[PDB]
Amino acid sequence: TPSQIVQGHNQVIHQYFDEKNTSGVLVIQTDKKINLYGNALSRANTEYVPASTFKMLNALIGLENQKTDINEIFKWKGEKRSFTAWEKDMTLGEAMKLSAVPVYQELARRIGLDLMQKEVKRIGFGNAEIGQQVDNFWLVGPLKVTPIQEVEFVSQLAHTQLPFSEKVQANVKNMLLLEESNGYKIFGKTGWAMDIKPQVGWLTGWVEQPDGKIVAFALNMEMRSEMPASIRNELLMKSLKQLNII
Numbered sequence: 001t002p003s004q005i006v007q008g009h010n011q012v013i014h015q016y017f018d019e020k021n022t023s024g025v026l027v028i029q030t031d032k033k034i035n036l037y038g039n040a041l042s043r044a045n046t047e048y049v050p051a052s053t054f055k056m057l058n059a060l061i062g063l064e065n066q067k068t069d070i071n072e073i074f075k076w077k078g079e080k081r082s083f084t085a086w087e088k089d090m091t092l093g094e095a096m097k098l099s100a101v102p103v104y105q106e107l108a109r110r111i112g113l114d115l116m117q118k119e120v121k122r123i124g125f126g127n128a129e130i131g132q133q134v135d136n137f138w139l140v141g142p143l144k145v146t147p148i149q150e151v152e153f154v155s156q157l158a159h160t161q162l163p164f165s166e167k168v169q170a171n172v173k174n175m176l177l178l179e180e181s182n183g184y185k186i187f188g189k190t191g192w193a194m195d196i197k198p199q200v201g202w203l204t205g206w207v208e209q210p211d212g213k214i215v216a217f218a219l220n221m222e223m224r225s226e227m228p229a230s231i232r233n234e235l236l237m238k239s240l241k242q243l244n245i246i
């Protein structure tokens, strides 16, 4: 009789990250209970730059302080953008789905350094430090946040418990919908800080199950330039399936 290796979801997710030859953590929160998965659990309490995940908070601050509205069309003013898909006029919500940096730089500059630092410190996001550069403080420092802090933030968003108006949080939630099928909804925001070393990849969001239960997640991993952007989505979805969340 041979031995049998018993692969629980903890071992599977740890080895999912090992297979990509990188370090990563998946933070899960539901019913005010947080679980850690992956091959680098100490990442969960390490500060990283939020990169494009900060768009969620940018949008909340801009809508709450009436610097924009969900129907405003941000015009493409003619510079070569990083992707041709970004070279069009679009709303805040379309820019959220596309992670269209220049729209959120326009919004950040409307908010202004003063209001932004004060709203970020009021929310208590991460180390709550934005420095003097209002258009990149979430990409190159000084703002940093742990994956646990991101799961706590996004779970509050999903529950409309952040210190913002209900309608503002509801509108930002609708910008983050990624997938709907069979009574499940998945919301989230990817991020990838390429200019810092080591690079950091994010995928933060939540699942709404058919009975309404919310299961929030923050995936955080080291990226390398040869990786496809979809590696974050692949690792998230396989792990969510292994955990029976979807």
Ligand SMILES: *C(=O)[C@H]([C@@H](C)O)[C@@]1(C)CC(S[C@@H]2CN[C@H](C(=O)N(C)C)C2)=C(C(=O)O)N1
Binding pocket: 050, 051, 052, 053, 098, 099, 100, 101, 139, 190, 191, 192, 193, 194, 224, 225, 226, 227, 228, 229
């Ligand atoms: C968000 O974090 C990031 C901001 C910081 O620019 C943004 C908008 C770009 C990317 S992907 C990035 C651009 N092209 C690189 C690439 O694919 N290769 C081949 C290295 C990485 C993202 C993202 O989340 O994917 N968002």
